[PDB]
Amino acid sequence: VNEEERLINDLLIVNKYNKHVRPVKHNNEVVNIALSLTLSNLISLKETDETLTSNVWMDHAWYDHRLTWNASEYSDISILRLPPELVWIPDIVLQNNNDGQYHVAYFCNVLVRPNGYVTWLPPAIFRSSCPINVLYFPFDWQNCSLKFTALNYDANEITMDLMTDTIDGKDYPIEWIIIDPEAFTENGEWEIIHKPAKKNIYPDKFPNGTNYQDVTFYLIIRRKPLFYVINFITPCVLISFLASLAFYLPAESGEKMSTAISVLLAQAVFLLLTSQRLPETALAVPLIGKYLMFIMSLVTGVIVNCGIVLNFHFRTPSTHVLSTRVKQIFLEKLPRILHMSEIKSGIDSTNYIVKQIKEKNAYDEEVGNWNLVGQTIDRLSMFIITPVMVLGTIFIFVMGNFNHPPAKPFEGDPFDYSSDHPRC
C-alpha cells in the first residue's frame, strides 16, 4: 500500500504534534523564517484608491525538528506533502493593506524533506496601500511597498530573514523580487524598474515587541505614458495652439472672443477629466495639473487681452479721444519693431452734404486708427504670449520626461539590488 500514510501518522498523531507551538527545543531559542517573493503579475495600481493590487507567490522556509524522519526506514520516501491546517506555519501578515485580507489566499500544501526543511509557496492577492507621489504625473514613477510583519510572535521568538540560494558553492541572499521571465507578462501600463528586497530592524523599539523586525519588498514601477500622451497631452497642447492662433483672427468678424472662449472651455473640460484620475492628496499638484493651471490662466489672460483689443477696436470718437502717446506707441514704433506690414438753397445743401461726408470720413479715419491700434496690440500680444506658452509647455514636458528613478534604489547604498549581480 501507500507508504506516506504510516509516515504522516507517525509524524503527527503518534508524536502529538501540537500546531500552536513554535518548533524549538528551548523557549529561549529562535526560529529563522527565510522569506521570498515571486511576482506573477502586477494587476493594477489604482490611483484613485491609492491601492496596489498584486498577484504574488509568497515563499516561506523554516526548520521543524519534529518533522524529520529516516528516509531509508520508510522505503525511501524523499519528500512529503501536508496541508497548512496540520502543521505549524508562521503567519507572515501583510501589515499595510486597504482591505481586510491580511493572509495568503490559498493555503497550499507544504513540502517536508527528511532533514526537517519545510518550504511553503502559497499564492496570494494583496491589495496594499501605496502612497502615490503625483508630483510628475503622468510621467511619474512610484515607490509602492509591501510590509510583511510577523504579528503572532516577537523578534526574540522568530527572526524573519531573506531566503538564500547557492551559486558556485557560495550563498548569495536574494535581496530582490524573483520574477520568472517566461511566466511573467508586463503590465499594460506599468513597468518594473527596481525591485529591491530589504530587512528592516528598528533599534528604538524593544526586541520583545512585535515591531522590532520587518521584511519589506519595494516595487519601483514606472508608468508608460503612451496612452496619456495620445489621449490627454496631445489634444490639450493642440487646443492650446488654437488659443495661440486666436490672435490671428481679425476684429471685423464676430469670432475673436468665441474661439478663445471655446478653447478655455476645452481646457476646463480637460481639467474636469484629469480631476477624476488622480488622488485628492494635497502633498503637491500634478505636473499635468499645474501645466493645465498655467495654460488656463494664460488663456484667461488671452481672453482678457481679446476683450481689450475688441474695446480698442470699437472706440468711437464720440466716446473716446485718441491720446497722443498711444497714437505714437501703438501706431509708429511697435509696428516697425515687429515688422508688421433760388440756387442758394441748393449750394447750401451741397455744402452741408460735403460737410457731413467730411465728418463721416474723419470718423472713419479715427476708427481706422483705432483698428490699427487693436491690430498692433494684438500682434504684440501674440509675440508675447505664444512663445512664452510654447517654451513653458516644452520646459514642463522635458522636466516630466527627464524624471527617471535613480540607478541605485537607495541613495545611501552603492549596491544596486539586481538579480544578475548577487553579492556575498
Binding site: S258, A282, V321, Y352
Partner: protein, 404 residues
C-alpha cells in the same frame, strides 16, 4: 517534549473562554483600552464613514492564567491564539457598516503574573457626522467609540492604556513613527482619549478616541476655486466689451455654463447632508447668481444700446441720472430745378439721419455709462464677497483645547 506544550496543557485543562475572569463573585475586570493608528485610509464624506487601520491595544488581568516560571523551564511569557483565552469584546460601537469585531485575531501575550496584553489589528469603518459647513476649508471631529458590546459597568471597568513605562498613563492615541504613513489629505491636529459617561444611565461606560483632523484644501482650491476665480474675472470683463462687438452675452452665458458645469461636478464630492450649506457651495451659488445678474444687466445694456428714437423716447429722469451726475463720478466724459429739389431733399434726409444718429448715440452713451457703473459695482461686490468668504474660511481653525 518542549515544556511550552506541557504548560499549555496544564493551563487549558479546565479553561473556558465563556466566563468572566472576576476572581470573586460580582467583581469587576479592569480592562485597559487604547489605539495605535497606523494609517488613516480615507474619510468618505459621501456616506459619513471614516476608514482607519488601527492596532487596538488591550490589557486585562486574568487570574486563571498564572504559573511559576521557576517551576517550569524559565518560561516568562507565552503566545496563545486569541480563540483559546477569554476575551472582552471591545467592538466599534459606532461602525457605519456591520463590521463590529476585530479582523486579524493575532495571538495574545500571557505573562506569568496573569497580565494579558492583546494587540489585534483591524480595518475599522466608523461613522461620524460631517460638519458640512466651511467645507473644504474645514476641520472634522470624527470619533471612534470602543466599549464591550455585551458587558456593562457592573462587569467590566474601562480605563486608559499605559505607556512603555508602566508608571505613566496615556490619554491620547499612540502613533508609531516607523509604521504610520501620513494621509495625503488630512492632518492629525489633536487626538485625545476620554471616558464619557451617561448621566441618565449608570450602567454604561465608554472610551472614545476623538480625532480632530484638519483638511488640506489644496486640491479643491486648485481644481475648483482657481477656475471659479477665472470665471469671475471673465464675468467682470462682460462689462467692458463694447455692445457693438456682439459678444457680451456670448461670453457671459459661456461663463454661466462653466459655473453650472463646475457646480454639477462637485455634486459627486460634496456631502448629501441637508443640515447646512458648505462654504464652497455657497461661494458657487454666489458666483452663479452674480453671473446671472451680469447676464441680466448685459441684456439691459444691449437694450439701452439698440434703442432708437423711432422705438423709444428717452425719459427725463434717466437723462438726469446717467448724463448729468454719474459721468462726473466715473471719470467718463465725451428740369434743372428738379435736381436742386432732389439735392435739398437728400440734404434734409441727411440732417434728419444725423439728428437720429445723435439721439441713438446718446442712448449708447447711457448704455456705456450704465455698463461702467455695473463694472465698478460688480467688481466691488465680487471682491467683498470673495474676501468675506475666504476670511470666514481662514478663521475655521480647530480650537487649541480639544475638550478630550
Amino acid at each position: 517534549s518542549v515544556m511550552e506544550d506541557t504548560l499549555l496543557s496544564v493551563l487549558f485543562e479546565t479553561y473556558n473562554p465563556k466566563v468572566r475572569p472576576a476572581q470573586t463573585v460580582g467583581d469587576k475586570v479592569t480592562v485597559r483600552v487604547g489605539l495605535t493608528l497606523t494609517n488613516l485610509l480615507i474619510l468618505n464624506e459621501k456616506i459619513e464613514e471614516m476608514t482607519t487601520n488601527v492596532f487596538l491595544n488591550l490589557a486585562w488581568t486574568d487570574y486563571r492564567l498564572q504559573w511559576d516560571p521557576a517551576a517550569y523551564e524559565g518560561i516568562k511569557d507565552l503566545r496563545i491564539p486569541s480563540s483559546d483565552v477569554w476575551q472582552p469584546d471591545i467592538v466599534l460601537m459606532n461602525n457605519n457598516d456591520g463590521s463590529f469585531e476585530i479582523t486579524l485575531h493575532v495571538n495574545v501575550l500571557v505573562q506569568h503574573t496573569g497580565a494579558v496584553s492583546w494587540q489585534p489589528s483591524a480595518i475599522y469603518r466608523s461613522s461620524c457626522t460631517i460638519k458640512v459647513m466651511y467645507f473644504p476649508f474645514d476641520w472634522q471631529n470624527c470619533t471612534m467609540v470602543f466599549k464591550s458590546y455585551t458587558y456593562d459597568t457592573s462587569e467590566v471597568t474601562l480605563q486608559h492604556a499605559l505607556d512603555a513605562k508602566g508608571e505613566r498613563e496615556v490619554k491620547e492615541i499612540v502613533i508609531n513613527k516607523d509604521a504610520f504613513t501620513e494621509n495625503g489629505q488630512w492632518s492629525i491636529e489633536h487626538k485625545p482619549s476620554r471616558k464619557n459617561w451617561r448621566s441618565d444611565d449608570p450602567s454604561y461606560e465608554d472610551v472614545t478616541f476623538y480625532l480632530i483632523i484638519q483638511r488640506k484644501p489644496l486640491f479643491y482650491i486648485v481644481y475648483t476655486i482657481i477656475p471659479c476665480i477665472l470665471i469671475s474675472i471673465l464675468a467682470i470683463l462682460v462689462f467692458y466689451l463694447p455692445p457693438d462687438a456682439g459678444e457680451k452675452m456670448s461670453l457671459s452665458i459661456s461663463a454661466l455654463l462653466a459655473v453650472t458645469v463646475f457646480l454639477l461636478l462637485l455634486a459627486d464630492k460634496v456631502p448629501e447632508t441637508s443640515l447646512s450649506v458648505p462654504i464652497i457651495i455657497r461661494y458657487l451659488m454666489f458666483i452663479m447668481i452674480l453671473v446671472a445678474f451680469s447676464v441680466i444687466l448685459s441684456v439691459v445694456v444691449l437694450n439701452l444700446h439698440h434703442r432708437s428714437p423711432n422705438t423709444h423716447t428717452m425719459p427725463n429722469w434717466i437723462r438726469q441720472i446717467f448724463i448729468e451726475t454719474l459721468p462726473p463720478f466715473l471719470w467718463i466724459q465725451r428740369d434743372l430745378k428738379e435736381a436742386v429739389e432732389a439735392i435739398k431733399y437728400i440734404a434734409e434726409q441727411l440732417e434728419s439721419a444725423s439728428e437720429f444718429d445723435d439721439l441713438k448715440k446718446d442712448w449708447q452713451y447711457v448704455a456705456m455709462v450704465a455698463d461702467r457703473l455695473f463694472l465698478y459695482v460688480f467688481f466691488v461686490i465680487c471682491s467683498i464677497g470673495t474676501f468675506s468668504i475666504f476670511l470666514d474660511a481662514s478663521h475655521n481653525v480647530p480650537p487649541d483645547n480639544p475638550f478630550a
